[PDB]
Nucleic acid binder design. Structure first.
Ligand SMILES: Nc1ncnc2c1ncn2[C@@H]1O[C@H](COP(=O)(O)OP(=O)(O)OP(=O)(O)O)[C@@H](O)[C@H]1O
Ligand SMILES: [Mg+2]
Lengths: 99, 100, 49, 450, 349
RNA sequence: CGGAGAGGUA
DNA sequence: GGGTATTCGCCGCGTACCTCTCCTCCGCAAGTATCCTATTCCTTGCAGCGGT
DNA sequence: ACCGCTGCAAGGAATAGGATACTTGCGGGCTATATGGCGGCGAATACCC
């Protein structure tokens, strides 16, 4: 439904409004079972198990620096966007890195 | 080799060779014309980059690609690795009079 | 239509149905792949995952 | 207007009509004045105390501005052509005020010599000493001689050593700028603040608008640069455009009087105030050219300069040249056609052949007769019937008057015909209806919408 | 809906026509013009400038190519505002001094008008009658210009695509000067070569469209670049900002209080009236006129004439000014929506 | 023939 | 200078076999230039028209 | 019977809406960014004298 404003009127009016059942997209339909038919070949989209978006505090268990020093780190992991990480230099500093 | 649809396969080596030959012919013409130095300089930069990508692509941090955003297969990439000539066609190879 | 046909047709998680059983179909639909986009890689996954 | 006048005046005379190349930036702008401009903005100023004839065109945008205040000009510069009828000891005392030292073997900056007839200098600006050879109250040579060998490399006619920046840039002036800065503004520690930018040696983008700090003597109002006897000719009005420019400058000052980074001097410090500007235009003998009937008195006069009659042409009438063909018979005086370019003369020479008028080409407007058609090439933009001396000037923009089309056609609307459309709504549902812009539809009821 | 009804029959094969045009080109011997030293020295002396040592190299190449028994086909690719047009005039003089009917082809009406004025300016004493044919000239002027051309009295004819409309029959065509050829397609560039094969073509452009740049880089045409910007030109400072009324206002006032003029390129005809009204409410200090190639054309004549005479400052314009409008006072362009423009387009603007 | 991807046997 | 520290980019990571699918042109929008009818509006050419 | 002045009026000219040909971009188009590795090593800064 497309509204059209008029210019010289104050902020927010209507000249006309036109609506029309516009066609957009063909979405494949899941059959009665769970299989799609995509080009005549019957496909199945399996569920995926990924790390949940959020924030996680991990640490390599002294895998580096050979001192037994645990280098704690944090990841802010969005669902969609650019990641964010904080970590510790073996000198007990604190550095950020992006993507 | 034809793809059986009237067109031909990509065959990345010929693509790299066409790139190099095109830049080289253009630079030869532009050197014949005594063009100003700012133009011939980046022409020679382009030619150096093209021959670079022909001999060994990906040894620069930048690699040029065709389809699917993977870099092309250069003449050094046809020798290296598990799929080069040495490990896939010379040390061990497919054999006639054989069954399974 | 392009962004949807690309996902349904050619993805890593839209795969050809195993169909030599009723069991194979019904246990390939209830599959939990830990791979695909936004996930780990087959030959670079350690002993702990 | 100034630019326009610089083309018009040069058409009607031959004195050296010349502008004063202003910083093309806006008040407190962020751009540099493009050093080439300064090389023509200083040179004018160096000749200005002694120009003996000619016209200098300034707008009030530049007239209200302040400029380098003496010293720096007669200290850090030397312009001199061979036609400088000047002595030896005058240059001696001016270099004395410039602080140069009398050295017979000139080798380093700030050194000068006056021996016999030949004068030597090692200027502040360059690294080359020059031999001058004044004869008989006049300069005669520009001999580029070595720092030590005293052997001429080249004989030149005119020398230009101008500073390539409007303000002094050496270390002492930088220290002065910093000291005045700490006097007025406040320094913040940031590698982009202009205090540290200048201190590190670089000049920021709009550095010219922090001019007055560098000098420690107030900038002169540009009127000190005028000769002894000028005659300020005005145009239009000044006590209306100076005020407009002052208001706009104040607007820019408050607009950019934010941003603690890069702060600004008050407009009083880089511009005359309109009160001062009219304190100074009561110090020069003045002539105002204004386009309206001034009543009667001494110091007032009226020059009968009527406008041209209705001169226009159009291809609509079978006789297009009617206004001109009827004007040019009823005119006892001469007529000068003032075509724009050279080629346009031909585009006007084959159009006045259509009514048997062949214009001579004159050079100066006072070559016209009692009775003749002439044309001259310049850049004038509108005509006039000079009814004093009966002459007329018909500029080419008085043969192309106006365009008046788009007068349309009758009726773009019909009112109260087959369907009045009074419409206190009573219409049924499904009843055909006409929207004026889209045609026929079917009315399907009231509705409510967001 | 109905716009998809048209096409798909490839109604005409172009390969056969182009091959036959070129084949007729390569067979016929060219015209070898005659060069008079002093009689062209006077034309050089009328030039109120100095030919930079690359422009005077392009000019010498063009003349020594025209005075050869073959047929020229030269591209004069040189950066914008470097004086490519004076190459065209110093070749046009050599052509028409042998009574040879130059034909200049420009891809828009305003450029046609400007070139008409410039050519009348330059050839302002030599007896060569220059005329312009376009949609500005009315149908009682075209029907006389065409009769003149056919009888062979007009000796330079500057025209838009109206030139190549099959009713324009030159008597003795001797030189074709395509100007701003990164337009015109192909058939327009060849429609004048097709009628007279051995004609000499001098192709002026600043950013040649890729086909006729490759075809110059492979030897089919010659190429004579121009560098060494002429006298005191400064590289234009380019700024890329998100659109902002304050940026627009500051840019416009900086230009106007300098005294120059502004192209405010908008490139949308339906909304250009509202855009000019909005601009004139934003900047009361300016004088604003609208210029685009969909007016009654006696209004466009007036608008771009008044612009040349400083009668207004800001010109709210479409890309009709993309093709070499000179106006040496205009010193600020403001491209309204620069995201959808080609690299060549942005460079010409 | 190449590329990308999925899965399976020992 | 010079001894040692830290970081950074390149190298590598199993064999053999089997099965499957999926991989760019061509319409839209903007501008320009022209041409082509139909409608209406000056424009004057001719006939009227009363006056002489 | 002669004349200037105008009304009809035929057409002439300009003005609209429709069609066609270029240039440009956009955008998907049936062989044209991802972030879930790690270890070794030797060369290149770098740090502390
Ligand atoms: N050698 C020169 N020295 C100084 N000025 C020159 C020189 N050659 C040309 N000019 C000036 O520079 C301007 C360039 O305009 P011109 O049309 O001649 O070239 P152009 O603008 O690049 O061509 P186009 O109009 O096709 O873009 C002209 O006004 C001309 O007067
Ligand atoms: Mg040109």
């Amino acid at each position: 439904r497309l509204v059209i404003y008029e210019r010289e009127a104050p902020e927010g009016t209507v000249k006309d409004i036109k609506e029309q059942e516009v066609y957009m997209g063909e979405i494949p339909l899941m059959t009665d079972n769970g299989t799609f038919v995509i080009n005549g070949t019957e496909r199945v989209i399996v569920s995926q198990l990924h790390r949940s978006p959020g924030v996680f505090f991990d640490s390599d268990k002294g895998k580096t620096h050979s001192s037994g020093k645990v280098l704690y780190n944090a990841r802010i992991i969005p669902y969609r966007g650019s990641w964010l990480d904080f970590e510790f230099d073996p000198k007990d500093n604190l550095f950020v890195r992006i993507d | 080799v034809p793809l059986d649809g009237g067109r031909f396969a990509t065959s990345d080596l010929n693509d790299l060779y066409r790139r190099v030959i095109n830049r080289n012919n253009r630079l030869k013409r532009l050197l014949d014309l005594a063009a100003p130095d700012i133009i011939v300089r980046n022409e020679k930069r382009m030619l150096q980059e093209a021959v670079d990508a022909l001999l060994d692509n990906g040894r620069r941090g930048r690699a040029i690609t065709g389809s699917n955003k993977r870099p092309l297969k250069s003449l050094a990439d046809m020798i290296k690795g598990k799929q080069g000539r040495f490990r896939q066609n010379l040390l061990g190879k497919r054999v006639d009079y054989s069954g399974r | 239509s392009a962004a949807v046909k690309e996902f349904f047709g050619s993805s890593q998680l839209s795969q050809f149905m195993d169909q030599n059983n009723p069991l194979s179909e019904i246990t390939h639909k209830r599959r939990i792949s830990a791979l695909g986009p936004g996930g780990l890689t087959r030959e670079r996954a350690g002993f702990e995952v | 207007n100034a630019l326009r006048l610089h083309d018009e005046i040069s058409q009607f005379t031959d004195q050296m009509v010349m502008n004063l190349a202003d910083w093309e930036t806006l008040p407190y702008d962020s751009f540099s004045p493009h050093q080439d401009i300064i090389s023509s903005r200083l040179s004018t100023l160096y000749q200005l105390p002694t120009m003996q004839r000619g016209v200098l065109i300034v707008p009030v945008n530049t007239l209200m501005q302040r400029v380098c205040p003496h010293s720096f000009l007669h200290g850090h510069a030397l312009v001199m052509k061979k036609g400088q009828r000047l002595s030896r000891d005058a240059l001696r005392t001016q270099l004395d005020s410039a602080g140069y030292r009398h050295v017979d073997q000139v080798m380093e900056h700030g050194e000068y010599a006056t021996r016999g007839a030949l004068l030597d200098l090692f200027p502040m600006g360059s690294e080359l000493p020059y031999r001058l050879d004044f004869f008989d109250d006049e300069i005669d040579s520009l001999r580029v001689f070595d720092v030590d060998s005293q052997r001429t490399l080249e004989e030149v006619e005119a020398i230009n050593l101008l500073p390539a920046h409007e303000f002094p840039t050496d270390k002492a002036a930088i220290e002065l700028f910093r000291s005045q800065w700490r006097d007025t503004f406040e320094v913040k520690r940031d590698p982009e603040h202009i205090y540290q930018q200048v201190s590190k040696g670089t000049l920021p983008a709009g550095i010219e608008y922090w001019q007055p700090l560098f000098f420690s003597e107030p900038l002169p109002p540009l009127f000190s640069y005028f000769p002894a006897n000028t005659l300020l000719v005005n145009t239009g009005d000044l006590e209306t455009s100076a005020e407009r420019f002052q208001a706009d400058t104040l607007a820019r000052f408050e607009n950019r009087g934010v941003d603690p980074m890069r702060p600004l001097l008050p407009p009083q410090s880089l511009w005359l105030r309109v009160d001062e500007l009219f304190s100074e235009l009561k110090n020069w003998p003045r002539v105002q050219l204004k386009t309206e009937h001034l009543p009667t008195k001494a110091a007032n006069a009226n020059l009968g300069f009527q406008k041209l009659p209705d001169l226009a042409v159009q291809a609509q009438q079978k006789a297009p040249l009617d206004a001109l063909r009827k004007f040019l018979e009823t005119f006892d005086g001469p007529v000068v056609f003032s075509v724009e370019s050279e080629g346009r003369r031909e585009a006007l020479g084959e159009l006045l052949a259509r009514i048997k008028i062949a214009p001579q080409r004159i050079m100066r407007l006072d070559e016209a007769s009692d009775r003749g058609r002439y044309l001259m090439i310049g850049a004038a933009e509108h005509g006039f019937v000079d009814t004093v001396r009966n002459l007329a000037l018909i500029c080419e923009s008085d043969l192309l008057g106006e365009r008046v089309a788009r007068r349309r056609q009758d009726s773009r609307r019909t009112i109260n015909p087959d369907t009045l459309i009074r419409n206190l709504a009573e219409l049924h549902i499904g009843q055909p209806v006409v929207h004026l812009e889209h045609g026929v539809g079917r009315y399907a009821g009231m509705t409510t919408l967001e | 809906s109905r716009a998809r009804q048209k096409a798909a029959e490839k109604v005409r094969d172009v390969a056969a026509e182009l091959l036959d045009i070129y084949a007729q080109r390569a067979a016929k011997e060219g015209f070898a013009f005659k060069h008079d030293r002093e009689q062209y020295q006077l034309f050089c002396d009328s030039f109120p400038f100095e030919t930079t040592p690359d422009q005077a190299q392009a000019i010498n190449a063009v003349l020594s190519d025209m005075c050869q028994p073959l047929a020229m086909d030269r591209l004069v690719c040189g950066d914008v505002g470097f004086g490519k047009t004076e190459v065209a005039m110093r070749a046009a003089f050599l052509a028409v001094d042998n009574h040879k009917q130059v034909a200049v082809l420009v891809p828009t009406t305003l450029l046609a008008q400007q070139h008409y004025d410039n050519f009348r300016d330059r050839f302002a004493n030599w007896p060569v009658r220059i005329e312009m044919i376009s949609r500005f000239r009315s149908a009682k002027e075209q029907t006389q210009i065409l009769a003149e051309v056919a009888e062979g009295k007009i000796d330079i004819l500057i025209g838009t695509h109206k030139l190549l409309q099959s009713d324009v029959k030159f008597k003795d065509l001797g030189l074709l000067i395509v100007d701003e050829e990164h337009r015109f397609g192909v058939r327009h560039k060849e429609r004048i070569k097709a009628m007279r094969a051995n004609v000499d073509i001098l192709t002026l452009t600043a950013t040649p469209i890729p086909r006729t740049l490759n075809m110059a880089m492979s030897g089919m045409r010659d190429l004579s670049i121009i560098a060494t910007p002429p006298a005191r030109r400064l590289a234009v400072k380019t700024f890329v900002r998100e659109y902002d009324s304050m940026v627009v206002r500051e840019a416009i006032l900086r230009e106007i209080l300098r005294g120059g003029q502004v192209y405010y390129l908008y490139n949308d005809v339906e909304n250009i009236q509202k855009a000019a009204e909005r601009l004139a409410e934003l900047v009361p200090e300016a004088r604003i006129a609208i210029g685009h190639g969909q007016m009654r054309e006696r209004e466009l004549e007036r608008v771009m004439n008044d612009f040349h005479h400083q009668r207004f400052n800001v010109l709210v314009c479409t890309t009709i000014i993309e093709t070499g409008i000179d106006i040496p006072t205009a010193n600020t362009i403001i491209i309204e929506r620069a995201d959808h423009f080609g690299l060549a387009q942005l460079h010409q603007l």
